[PDB]
Amino acid sequence: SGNGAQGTKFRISLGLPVGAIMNCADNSGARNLYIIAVKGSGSRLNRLPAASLGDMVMATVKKGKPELRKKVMPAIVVRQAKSWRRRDGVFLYFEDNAGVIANPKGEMKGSAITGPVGKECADLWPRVASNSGVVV
Amino acid sequence: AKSLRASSHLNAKSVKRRGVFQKAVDAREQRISDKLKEDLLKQKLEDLKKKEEQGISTSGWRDGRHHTYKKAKLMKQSKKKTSFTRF
């Protein structure tokens, strides 16, 4: 379930297939992230790899700093607009899809995250929880 | 990964199975048997309360009907030559 993730992950509804564009919620200068791959994705004919909340993806920066663009970096999904079920008994969703730029060990490039962060992602990644100001 | 038919996993499963899982199964079986006996006793008590207001050789053939039917069947099989064991 990825390197740097703390523990196991239970299944979440998949919202972001390959080719999706999500907002960047950190302060590293990127404006949006373009998903090109999903870490830990399965193998099945014709099936697109898809990401969910708390998943690590490989993303290129489409809008942002010119020095920041034209390279592939790991990212962690912190918000999705597709509704998913919490085991406490409610389906819930956010307004947008959003992620943060991280390293293969799961450490944030930026120093803070703007906007709410999903509880699943915050509990899975200790550095996201350290940099998060709003957790749900 | 180790398959469902993996020998060492099955051996470890048997070692675990002989212990607490079998003990819990035995305790549940004893409780269920006690409840079944209680249910039979309660039905007996209700039947007694209802009646308060109101008040070996196994050889040979089973019966004559069975004797007649089986003898006719064997005679028919012999006549039509459709027997499995007898020429």
């Binding site: 607009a81 969703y93 307004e95 947008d96 | -």
Partner: protein, 131 residues
């Protein structure tokens, strides 16, 4: 369910909420910040000509003036009049945190309300003078 409502009120095409706009209009500092915006190349009109009530950018001051002389803007202004209807109102209607709802209502009636009205009046006269 139908296509018109689906493609207007998709989650990715959502607009700013009325209680957020009311909070923006309540304080004079927020109104000043929204009137004096930094130049953004990604916004219509370089981030200028922003209607606070409708939370909408215009490409030009003449477009902002035509928007102000319209029924859609009047509809939003009429919507932004009374209590903002937060979750406390629904809780009080169900019978939950009634005293908190009453305190919020009297605070809106006494302090937040007239200040927001005066800020709206100053914004209206500023827009009329500059446009």
């Amino acid at each position: 369910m139908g296509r018109y409502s689906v493609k207007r009120y998709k989650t990715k095409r959502r607009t700013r909420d009325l209680d957020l706009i009311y909070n923006d209009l309540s304080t004079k500092e927020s109104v000043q910040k929204l009137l004096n915006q930094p130049l953004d190349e990604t916004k219509p009109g370089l981030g200028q000509h922003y209607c606070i009530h409708c939370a909408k950018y215009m490409e030009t001051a003449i477009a902002l003036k035509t928007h102000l002389k319209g029924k859609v803007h009047k509809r939003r202004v009429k919507e932004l009049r009374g209590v903002p209807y937060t979750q406390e109102v629904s809780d009080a209607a169900a019978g939950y945190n009634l005293n908190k709802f009453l305190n919020r209502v009297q605070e809106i009636t006494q302090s937040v309300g007239p200040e927001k009205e005066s800020n709206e009046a100053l914004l209206k006269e500023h827009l009329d003078s500059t446009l």
